[PDB]
């Protein structure tokens, strides 16, 4: 059989999270890098791209356009959306909040520099007020290692990798919120997830401008 | 019966209303006025995140738009019949959501902002949404969306229809098979009855309630 093939170019993006949840599932991928506009094109006009856009994920015979329709279905291939209706509310609710914040987070280096810092202050204020009480409250009402039925789901994942690039912004963020470490260490700690944190992993660095202008070139 | 915690507009709680609708499920609306009224939910932690949307159903207080309109779509059978399907489903309706995002925040724009950014929405449209969910039903010449079934995809979708005509009766025009979804999907019972006078169904956002909206979310 085939496995996964990866659309999208070679930085975190709108793929990372993708990235995580296959590894941490134990999946094997491949990535097909784009490397310019003309390789975003030729995906176009041999109409690959649903809406013209990646994260593209080539699985199970279907080309999956969308971060949430891709993600979805691997989690629920891999058991990892939880076991019933009842469950995936509360993961999807707890998902949802991480998304919100991985997106402020992802769209801070192409936000003009006029008001970067002005956002950055307020990513930092949601985190300490809003965003990781939520989720400290979930770990504190039942106390058990995963943020849902007791079993590892997608939330965990997501929420871990979230907390690396909250780490990357301001590692004192964490440190009023022990129930949040705690779940970090142990996830990191998943064989899985410890092999894709070591080096040579898919795993994306933090973009800096080299790649921030590729994105430039191959996006417009 | 479902408790639905917003303010009285469409917002990100219309999708939500025209969902249980049209799954021919009545629901009570608990309208907040004020930032007060918002506070009192906060503080008694109804909101998981401090935020509406909210829906009281089944013993949970589900925050978040997706959260509550995933879990109605599973419980009223709108998600199809496997994953496979619910990626279909959920690569359409996310196609559609950032449609939806564009011309929800519309009114909110920065009014030096506001001749561009509608031009844009008339382009993607006219070359990029519009084209691809007419090439998906052209594609199986079905009725519906996914299945050869209702579901959710036909809901979300026909509900941004009538946010296009709003917008401008003419970008529907050289989408025939579009056309005649909005047609078949307003003429189902529960949709029907929605569509007419005097439903939940909310008003597009004038001036009042835009300032409404800004005082509660300060
Ligand atoms: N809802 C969808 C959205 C899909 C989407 O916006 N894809 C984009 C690339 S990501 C972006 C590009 C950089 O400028 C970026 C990359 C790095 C950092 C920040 C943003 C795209 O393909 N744009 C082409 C076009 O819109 O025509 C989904 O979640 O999948
Ligand atoms: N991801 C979540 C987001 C939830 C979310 O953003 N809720 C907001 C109200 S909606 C917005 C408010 C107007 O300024 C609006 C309402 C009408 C028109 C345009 C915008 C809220 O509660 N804001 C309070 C606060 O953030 O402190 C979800 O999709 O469910």
């Given at each position: 059989?085939?496995?996964?093939?990866?659309?999208?170019?070679?930085?975190?993006?709108?793929?990372?999270?993708?990235?995580?949840?296959?590894?941490?599932?134990?999946?094997?991928?491949?990535?097909?890098?784009?490397?310019?506009?003309?390789?975003?094109?030729?995906?176009?006009?041999?109409?690959?791209?649903?809406?013209?856009?990646?994260?593209?994920?080539?699985?199970?015979?279907?080309?999956?356009?969308?971060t949430?329709?891709?993600?979805?279905?691997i989690?629920?291939?891999?058991?990892?959306?939880?076991?019933?209706?009842?469950?995936?509310?509360?993961?999807?609710?707890?998902?949802?909040?991480?998304?919100?914040?991985?997106?402020?987070?992802?769209?801070?280096?192409?936000?003009?520099?006029?008001?970067?810092?002005?956002?950055?202050?307020?990513?930092?204020?949601?985190?300490?007020?809003?965003?990781?009480?939520?989720?400290?409250?979930?770990?504190?009402?039942?106390?058990?290692?995963?943020?849902?039925?007791?079993?590892?789901?997608?939330?965990?994942?997501?929420?871990?990798?979230?907390?690396?690039?909250?780490?990357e912004?301001?590692?004192?963020?964490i440190?009023?919120?022990?129930?949040?470490?705690?779940?970090?260490?142990?996830?990191?700690?998943?064989?899985?997830?410890?092999?894709?944190?070591?080096?040579?992993?898919?795993?994306?660095?933090?973009?800096?401008?080299?790649?921030?202008?590729?994105?430039?070139?191959?996006?417009?």
């Amino acid at each position: 059989a085939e496995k996964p093939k990866l659309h999208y170019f070679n930085a975190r993006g709108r793929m990372e999270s993708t990235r995580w949840l296959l590894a941490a599932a134990g999946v094997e991928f491949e990535e097909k890098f784009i490397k310019s506009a003309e390789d975003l094109d030729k995906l176009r006009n041999d109409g690959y791209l649903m809406f013209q856009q990646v994260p593209m994920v080539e699985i199970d015979g279907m080309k999956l356009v969308q971060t949430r329709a891709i993600l979805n279905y691997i989690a629920s291939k891999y058991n990892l959306y939880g076991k019933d209706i009842k469950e995936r509310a509360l993961i999807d609710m707890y998902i949802e909040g991480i998304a919100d914040l991985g997106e402020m987070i992802l769209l801070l280096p192409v936000c003009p520099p006029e008001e970067k810092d002005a956002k950055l202050a307020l990513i930092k204020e949601k985190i300490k007020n809003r965003y990781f009480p939520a989720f400290e409250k979930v770990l504190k009402s039942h106390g058990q290692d995963y943020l849902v039925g007791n079993k590892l789901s997608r939330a965990d994942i997501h929420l871990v990798e979230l907390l690396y690039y909250v780490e990357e912004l301001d590692s004192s963020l964490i440190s009023s919120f022990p129930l949040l470490k705690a779940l970090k260490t142990r996830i990191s700690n998943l064989p899985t997830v410890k092999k894709f944190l070591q080096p040579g992993s898919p795993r994306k660095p933090p973009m800096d401008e080299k790649s921030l202008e590729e994105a430039r070139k191959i996006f417009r």
